[PDB]
C-alpha positions as CSV (number, residue, x, y, z in Angstrom):
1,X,201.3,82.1,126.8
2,X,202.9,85.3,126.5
3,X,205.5,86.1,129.4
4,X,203.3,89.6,129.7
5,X,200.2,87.6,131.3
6,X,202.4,84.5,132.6
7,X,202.4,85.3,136.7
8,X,200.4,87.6,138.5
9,X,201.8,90.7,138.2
10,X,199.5,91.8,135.6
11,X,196.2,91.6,138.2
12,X,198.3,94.8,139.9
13,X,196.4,97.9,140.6
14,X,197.7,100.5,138.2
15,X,198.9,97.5,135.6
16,X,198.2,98.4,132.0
17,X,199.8,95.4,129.4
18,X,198.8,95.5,125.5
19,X,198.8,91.9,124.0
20,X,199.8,92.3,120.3
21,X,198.8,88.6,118.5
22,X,197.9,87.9,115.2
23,X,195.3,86.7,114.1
24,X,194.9,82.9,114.8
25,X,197.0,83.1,117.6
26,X,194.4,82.2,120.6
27,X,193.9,84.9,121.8
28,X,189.9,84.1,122.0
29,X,190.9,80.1,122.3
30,X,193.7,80.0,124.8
31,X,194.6,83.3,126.0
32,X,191.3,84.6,127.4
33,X,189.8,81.5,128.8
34,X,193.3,81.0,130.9
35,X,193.2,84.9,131.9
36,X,189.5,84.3,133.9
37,X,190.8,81.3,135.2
38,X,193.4,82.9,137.0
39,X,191.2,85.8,138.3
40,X,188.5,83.3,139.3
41,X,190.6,81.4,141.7
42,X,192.0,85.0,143.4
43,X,188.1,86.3,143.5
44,X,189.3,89.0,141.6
45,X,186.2,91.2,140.2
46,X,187.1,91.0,136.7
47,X,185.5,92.8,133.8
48,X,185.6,92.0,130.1
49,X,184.6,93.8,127.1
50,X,183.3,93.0,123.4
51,X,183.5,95.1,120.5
52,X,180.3,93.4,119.1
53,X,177.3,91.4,119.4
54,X,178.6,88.7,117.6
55,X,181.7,88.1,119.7
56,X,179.9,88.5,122.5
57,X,177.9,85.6,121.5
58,X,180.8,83.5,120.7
59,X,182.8,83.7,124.3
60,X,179.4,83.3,125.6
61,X,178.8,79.8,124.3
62,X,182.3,79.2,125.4
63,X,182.9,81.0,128.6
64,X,179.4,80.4,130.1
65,X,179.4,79.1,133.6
66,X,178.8,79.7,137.3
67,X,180.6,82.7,138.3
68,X,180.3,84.2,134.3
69,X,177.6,86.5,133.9
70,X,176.7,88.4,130.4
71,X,174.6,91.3,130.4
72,X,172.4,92.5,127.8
73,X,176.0,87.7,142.2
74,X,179.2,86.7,139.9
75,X,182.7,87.5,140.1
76,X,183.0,87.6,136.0
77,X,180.9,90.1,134.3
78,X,181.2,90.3,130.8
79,X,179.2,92.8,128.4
80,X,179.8,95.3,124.9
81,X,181.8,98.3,124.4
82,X,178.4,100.4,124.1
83,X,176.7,98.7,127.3
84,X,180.0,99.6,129.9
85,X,179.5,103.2,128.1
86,X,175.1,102.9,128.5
87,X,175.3,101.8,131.8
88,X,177.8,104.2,133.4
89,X,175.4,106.8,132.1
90,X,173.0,105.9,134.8
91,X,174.3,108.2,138.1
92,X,174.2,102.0,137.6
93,X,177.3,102.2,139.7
94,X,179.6,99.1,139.7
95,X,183.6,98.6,140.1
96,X,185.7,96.1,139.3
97,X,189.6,94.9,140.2
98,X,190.5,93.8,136.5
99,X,189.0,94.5,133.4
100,X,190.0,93.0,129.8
101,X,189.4,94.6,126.4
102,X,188.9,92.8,123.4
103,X,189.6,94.5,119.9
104,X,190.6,98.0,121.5
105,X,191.3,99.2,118.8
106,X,187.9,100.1,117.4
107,X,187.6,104.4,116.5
108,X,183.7,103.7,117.3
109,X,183.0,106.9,119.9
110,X,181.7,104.2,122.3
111,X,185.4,102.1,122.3
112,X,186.8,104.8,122.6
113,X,185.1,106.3,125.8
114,X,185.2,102.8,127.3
115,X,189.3,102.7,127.0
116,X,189.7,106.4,128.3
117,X,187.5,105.5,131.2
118,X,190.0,102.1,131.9
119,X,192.7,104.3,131.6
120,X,192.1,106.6,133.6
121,X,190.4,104.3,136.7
122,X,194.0,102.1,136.3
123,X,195.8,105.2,136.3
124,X,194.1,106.0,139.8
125,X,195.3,102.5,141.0
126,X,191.7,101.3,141.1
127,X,192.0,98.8,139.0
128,X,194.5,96.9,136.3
129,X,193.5,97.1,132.5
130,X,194.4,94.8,129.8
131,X,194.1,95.6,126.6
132,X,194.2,93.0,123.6
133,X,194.5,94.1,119.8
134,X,196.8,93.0,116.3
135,X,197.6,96.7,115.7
136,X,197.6,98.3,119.2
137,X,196.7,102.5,118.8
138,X,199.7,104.3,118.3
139,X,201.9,102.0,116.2
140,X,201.8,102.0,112.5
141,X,202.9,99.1,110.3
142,X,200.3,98.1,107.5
143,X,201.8,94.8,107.1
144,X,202.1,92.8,110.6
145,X,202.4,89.0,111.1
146,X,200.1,85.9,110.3
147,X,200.3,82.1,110.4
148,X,200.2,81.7,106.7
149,X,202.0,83.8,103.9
150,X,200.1,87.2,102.7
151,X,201.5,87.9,99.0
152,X,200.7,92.0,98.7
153,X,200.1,93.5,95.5
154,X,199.2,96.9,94.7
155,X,196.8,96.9,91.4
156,X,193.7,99.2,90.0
157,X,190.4,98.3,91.9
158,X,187.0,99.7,90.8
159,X,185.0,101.8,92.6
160,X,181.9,100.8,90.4
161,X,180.6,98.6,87.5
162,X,183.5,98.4,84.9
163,X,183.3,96.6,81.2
164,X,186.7,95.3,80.7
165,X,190.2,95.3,82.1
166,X,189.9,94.0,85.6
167,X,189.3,90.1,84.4
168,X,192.0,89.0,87.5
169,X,188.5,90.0,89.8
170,X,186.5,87.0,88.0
171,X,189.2,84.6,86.9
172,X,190.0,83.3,90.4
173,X,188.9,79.6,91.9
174,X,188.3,80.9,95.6
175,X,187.1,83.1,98.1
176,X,187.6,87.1,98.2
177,X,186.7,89.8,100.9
178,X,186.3,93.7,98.9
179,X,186.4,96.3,101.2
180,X,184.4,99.1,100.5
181,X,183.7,102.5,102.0
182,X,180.3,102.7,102.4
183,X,177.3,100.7,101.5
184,X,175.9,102.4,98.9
185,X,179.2,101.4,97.0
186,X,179.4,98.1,97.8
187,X,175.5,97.7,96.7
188,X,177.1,98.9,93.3
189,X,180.2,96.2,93.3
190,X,177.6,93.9,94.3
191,X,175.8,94.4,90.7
192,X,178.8,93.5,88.7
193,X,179.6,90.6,90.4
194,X,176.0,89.4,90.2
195,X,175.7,90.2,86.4
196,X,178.9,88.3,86.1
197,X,177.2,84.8,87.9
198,X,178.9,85.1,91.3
199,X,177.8,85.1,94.5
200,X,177.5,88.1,96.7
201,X,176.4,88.7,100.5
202,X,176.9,92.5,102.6
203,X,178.3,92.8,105.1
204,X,177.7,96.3,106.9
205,X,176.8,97.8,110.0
206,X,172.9,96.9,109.8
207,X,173.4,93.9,108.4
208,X,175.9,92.3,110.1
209,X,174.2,90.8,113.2
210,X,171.4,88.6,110.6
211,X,173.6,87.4,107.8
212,X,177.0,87.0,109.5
213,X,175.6,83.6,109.9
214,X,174.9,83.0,106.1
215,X,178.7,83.8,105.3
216,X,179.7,80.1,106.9
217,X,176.5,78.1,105.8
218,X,176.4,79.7,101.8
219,X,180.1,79.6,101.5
220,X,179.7,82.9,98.9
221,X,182.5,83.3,96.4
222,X,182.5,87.3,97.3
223,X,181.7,89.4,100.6
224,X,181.3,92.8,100.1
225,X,182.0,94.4,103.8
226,X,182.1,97.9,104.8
227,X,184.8,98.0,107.6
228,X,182.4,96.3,110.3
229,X,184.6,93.1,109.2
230,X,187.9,94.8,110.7
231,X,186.3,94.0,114.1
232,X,186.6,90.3,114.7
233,X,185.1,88.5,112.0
234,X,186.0,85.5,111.0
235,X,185.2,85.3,106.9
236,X,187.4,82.1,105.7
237,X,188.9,83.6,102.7
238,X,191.9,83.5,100.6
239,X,192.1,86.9,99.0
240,X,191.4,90.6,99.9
241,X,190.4,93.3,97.5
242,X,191.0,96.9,99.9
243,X,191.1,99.9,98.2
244,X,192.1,101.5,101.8
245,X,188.9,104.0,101.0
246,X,186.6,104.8,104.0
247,X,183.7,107.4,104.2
248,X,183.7,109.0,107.7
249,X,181.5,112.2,109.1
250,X,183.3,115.3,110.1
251,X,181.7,118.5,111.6
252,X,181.8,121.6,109.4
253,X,180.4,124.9,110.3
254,X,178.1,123.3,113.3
255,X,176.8,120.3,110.6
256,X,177.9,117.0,110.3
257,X,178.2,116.2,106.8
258,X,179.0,112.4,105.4
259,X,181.0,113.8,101.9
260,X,183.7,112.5,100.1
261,X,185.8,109.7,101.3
262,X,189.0,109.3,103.5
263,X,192.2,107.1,103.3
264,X,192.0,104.5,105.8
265,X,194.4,104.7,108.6
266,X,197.3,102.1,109.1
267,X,196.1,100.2,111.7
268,X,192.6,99.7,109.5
269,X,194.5,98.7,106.6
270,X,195.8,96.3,108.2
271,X,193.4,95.1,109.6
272,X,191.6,94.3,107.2
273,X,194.9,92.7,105.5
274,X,194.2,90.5,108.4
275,X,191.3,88.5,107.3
276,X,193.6,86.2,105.7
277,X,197.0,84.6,106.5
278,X,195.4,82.5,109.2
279,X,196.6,79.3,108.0
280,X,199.8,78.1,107.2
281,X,200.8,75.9,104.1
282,X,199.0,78.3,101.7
283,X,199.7,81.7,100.2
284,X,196.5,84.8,101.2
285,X,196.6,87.6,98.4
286,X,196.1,91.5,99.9
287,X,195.1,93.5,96.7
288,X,195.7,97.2,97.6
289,X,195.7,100.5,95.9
290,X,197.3,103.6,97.3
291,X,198.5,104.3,100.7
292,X,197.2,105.0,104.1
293,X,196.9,107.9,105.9
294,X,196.9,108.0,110.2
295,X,195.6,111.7,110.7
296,X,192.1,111.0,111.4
297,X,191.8,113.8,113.8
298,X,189.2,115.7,111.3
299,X,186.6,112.9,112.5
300,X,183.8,113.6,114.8
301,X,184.3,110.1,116.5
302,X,187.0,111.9,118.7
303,X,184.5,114.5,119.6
304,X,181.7,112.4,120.3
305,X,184.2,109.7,122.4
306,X,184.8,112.4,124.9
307,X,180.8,113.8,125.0
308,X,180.7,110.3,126.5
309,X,183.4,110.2,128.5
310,X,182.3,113.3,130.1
311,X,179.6,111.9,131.4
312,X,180.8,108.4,132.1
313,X,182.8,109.8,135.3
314,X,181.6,109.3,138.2
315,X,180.2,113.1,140.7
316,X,182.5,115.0,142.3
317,X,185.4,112.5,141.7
318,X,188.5,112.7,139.1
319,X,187.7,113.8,135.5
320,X,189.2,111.2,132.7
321,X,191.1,111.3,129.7
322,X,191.4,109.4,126.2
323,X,193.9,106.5,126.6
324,X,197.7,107.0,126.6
325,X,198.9,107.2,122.8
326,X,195.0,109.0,121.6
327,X,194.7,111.4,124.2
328,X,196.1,114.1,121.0
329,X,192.4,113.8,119.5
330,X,190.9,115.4,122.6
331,X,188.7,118.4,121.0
332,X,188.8,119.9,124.7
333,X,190.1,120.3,128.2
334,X,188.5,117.1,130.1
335,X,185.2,117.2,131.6
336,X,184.4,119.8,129.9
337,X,181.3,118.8,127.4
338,X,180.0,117.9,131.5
339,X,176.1,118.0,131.5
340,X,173.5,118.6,134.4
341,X,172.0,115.8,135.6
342,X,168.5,116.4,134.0
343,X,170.3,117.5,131.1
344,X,172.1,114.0,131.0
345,X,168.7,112.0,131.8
346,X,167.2,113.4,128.1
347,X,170.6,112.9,126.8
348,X,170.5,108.9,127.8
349,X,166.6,108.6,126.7
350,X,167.6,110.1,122.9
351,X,171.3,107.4,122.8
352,X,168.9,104.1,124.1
353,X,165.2,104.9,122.9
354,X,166.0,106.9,119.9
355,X,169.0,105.8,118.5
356,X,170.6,109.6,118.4
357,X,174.3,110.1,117.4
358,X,176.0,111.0,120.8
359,X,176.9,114.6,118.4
360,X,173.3,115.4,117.9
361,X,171.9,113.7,121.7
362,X,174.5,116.1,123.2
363,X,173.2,119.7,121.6
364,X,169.7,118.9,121.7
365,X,169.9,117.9,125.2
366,X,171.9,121.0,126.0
367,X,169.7,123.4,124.2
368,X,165.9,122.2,124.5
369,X,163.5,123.4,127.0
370,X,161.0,120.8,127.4
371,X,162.0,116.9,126.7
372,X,158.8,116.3,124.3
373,X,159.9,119.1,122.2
374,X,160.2,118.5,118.6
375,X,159.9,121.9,117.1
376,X,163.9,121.8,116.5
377,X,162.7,119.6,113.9
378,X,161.5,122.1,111.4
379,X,162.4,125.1,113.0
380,X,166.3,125.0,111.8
381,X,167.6,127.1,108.7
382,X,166.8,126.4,105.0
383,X,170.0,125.3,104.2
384,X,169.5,122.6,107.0
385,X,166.8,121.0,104.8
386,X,166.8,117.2,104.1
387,X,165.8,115.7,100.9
388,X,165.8,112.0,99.5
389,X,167.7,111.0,96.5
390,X,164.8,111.3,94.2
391,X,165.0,115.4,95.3
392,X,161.5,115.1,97.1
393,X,161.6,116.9,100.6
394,X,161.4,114.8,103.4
395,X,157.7,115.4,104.5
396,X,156.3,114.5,107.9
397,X,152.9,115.4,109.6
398,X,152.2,116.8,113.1
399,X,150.0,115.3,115.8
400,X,147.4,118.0,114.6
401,X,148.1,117.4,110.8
402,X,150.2,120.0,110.0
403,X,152.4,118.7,107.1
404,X,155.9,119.6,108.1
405,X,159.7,120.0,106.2
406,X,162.4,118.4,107.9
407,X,165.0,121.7,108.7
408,X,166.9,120.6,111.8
409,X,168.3,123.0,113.8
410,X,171.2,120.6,114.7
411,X,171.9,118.8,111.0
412,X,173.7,115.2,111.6
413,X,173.8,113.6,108.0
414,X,173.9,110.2,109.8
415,X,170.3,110.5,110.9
416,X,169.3,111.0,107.3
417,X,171.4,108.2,106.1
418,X,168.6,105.7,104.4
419,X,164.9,105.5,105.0
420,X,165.5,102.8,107.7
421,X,167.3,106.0,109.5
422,X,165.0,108.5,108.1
423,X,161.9,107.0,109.2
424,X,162.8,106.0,112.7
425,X,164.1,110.0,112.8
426,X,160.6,111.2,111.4
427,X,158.7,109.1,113.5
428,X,161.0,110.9,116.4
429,X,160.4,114.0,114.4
430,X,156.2,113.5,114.3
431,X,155.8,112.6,117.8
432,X,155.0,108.8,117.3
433,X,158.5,107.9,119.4
């Protein structure tokens, strides 16, 4: 066990330790079961955090027991990223001595909120923080340590269906993870592999929870993931095809538009170089093109992390911060995208019941009269209109049959994303939710 955690010094009010491991160190095996031991025998009010459902699921078949309790009384209360964020938004009022992160490292606006929060409750010697990530925010090597050798090679990789040139892709007895930047492009790398007899399965952020299941029983010879792999997933492969690519929204002249794609930053590239190397005797492949870049401060995930953050705090009690080495991304001054309380009640209803972006929850909430408006709808500019990808206008009808054109007044291209997002936003839209 690290000499960081070995002890009880780290239990301290105002103690903040980052446990860098590699993957395949224990850190979910040895490390974590051995750090609620320890608070368990002191009674210590510990609280642990996963970055998603899936891990969630896995320390709960493992830490499960009589003073554990998961969520969504006990002395260990373990729950997600987005939940800690959810239920703090509730003036839902807990506290807790310790609390553990896992993977806090994620750029997701809720992660994010969730370690600023941590931060800034340790900071007030309320409680001690731990934080627990391979490439911990502020340092910046692409190539870290692993169990097994990872042989890095930079060549070509297509960004769509090619006809010759690339037969190292086929001609390859084992098992390969392509990174891709969105899911409309991995839907396209998934077609050439296909034609070519191989097998395929997504991996993205609405598929991730029903088929990460199928990776382990199928055993496919290719997984096409769009970045919701960097995020504990275990995937058994030998190779890694990255093109360090990632498509990101970014707020430009009061829209959020999702154009163009990004380099990946450094602690992304790698990792996702850290899928493989988890076992020694054998030599991973990391197949790469181009570098990275670590100024992602154009993102709206910073602005959207402190929306929440703003609102996490508790009333008339110390505003918080971004964590140490992030608090540079902070748009503004904090606590100040604060809403009123019966602002922030129609703020929570659009995040849980209608699945808003916390950008577009926080203007409509802020600018509405009435909380069964939906006039804001249709009543934005033209150049706010929203259209499939046949051309068709996106068409929805009134209560009183009125056939309406989706303008929003607030335009998040996120909402408009695919017809799975589209519909539940029109159904929002026409009343029906």
């Amino acid at each position: 066990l690290p000499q960081s955690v070995v002890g009880t010094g780290w239990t301290a009010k105002g103690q903040i330790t980052v446990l860098d491991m590699h993957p395949g160190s224990g850190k979910t095996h040895r490390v974590l079961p051995e750090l609620i031991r320890q608070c368990v025998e002191r009674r210590l009010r510990t609280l642990v955090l996963a970055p998603t459902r899936v891990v969630l699921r896995e320390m709960e078949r493992a830490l499960s027991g009589k003073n554990v309790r998961f969520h969504s009384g006990a002395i260990v209360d373990v729950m997600c990223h987005a939940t800690y964020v959810n239920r703090r938004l509730l003036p839902g009022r807990q506290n807790w001595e310790v609390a553990i992160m896992d993977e806090a490292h994620w750029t997701d606006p809720h992660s994010i909120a969730a370690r600023g929060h941590l931060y800034s409750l340790a900071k007030e010697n309320r409680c001690a923080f731990v934080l627990m990530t391979a490439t911990p925010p502020g340092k910046s090597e692409p190539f870290p340590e692993s169990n097994g050798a990872i042989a890095s090679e930079e060549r070509q990789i297509p960004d769509g269906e090619w006809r010759d040139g690339f037969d190292w892709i086929t001609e390859y007895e084992g098992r390969t993870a392509w990174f891709v930047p969105s899911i409309a492009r991995g839907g396209a790398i998934a077609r050439a592999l296909r034609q070519r007899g191989k097998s395929v399965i997504c991996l993205n952020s609405k598929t991730f929870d029903k088929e990460y299941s199928r990776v382990k029983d199928e055993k496919p010879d290719f997984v096409v993931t769009t970045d919701i792999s960097e995020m504990g997933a275990n995937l058994d492969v030998t190779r890694v095809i990255d093109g360090r690519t990632n498509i990101k929204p970014e707020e430009v002249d009061g829209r959020i538009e999702l154009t163009g794609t990004r380099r990946v930053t450094t602690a992304s590239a790698a990792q996702r170089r850290g899928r493989v190397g988890r076992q020694g005797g054998r030599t991973d492949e990391y197949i790469y093109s181009g570098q990275c870049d670590d100024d992602d401060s154009g993102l709206v995930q910073w602005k959207e992390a402190q929306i929440l953050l703003d609102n996490i705090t508790t009333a008339r009690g110390p505003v918080a911060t971004f964590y140490g080495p992030e608090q540079e991304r902070m748009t503004e001054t904090a606590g100040h995208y604060r809403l009123p309380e019966e602002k922030r009640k129609h703020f929570r209803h659009l995040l849980a019941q209608c699945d808003f972006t916390p950008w577009l929850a926080w203007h409509v909430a802020a600018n509405v009269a009435s909380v069964t408006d939906r006039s804001w709808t249709w009543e934005g500019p033209e150049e706010n209109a929203v259209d499939e990808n046949n051309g068709e206008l996106v068409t929805f009808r009134s209560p009183n049959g009125a056939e309406r054109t989706l303008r929003p007044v607030w335009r998040d291209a996120r909402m408009f994303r695919e017809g799975r997002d589209i519909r539940e936003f029109v159904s929002y839209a026409s009343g029906r939710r």
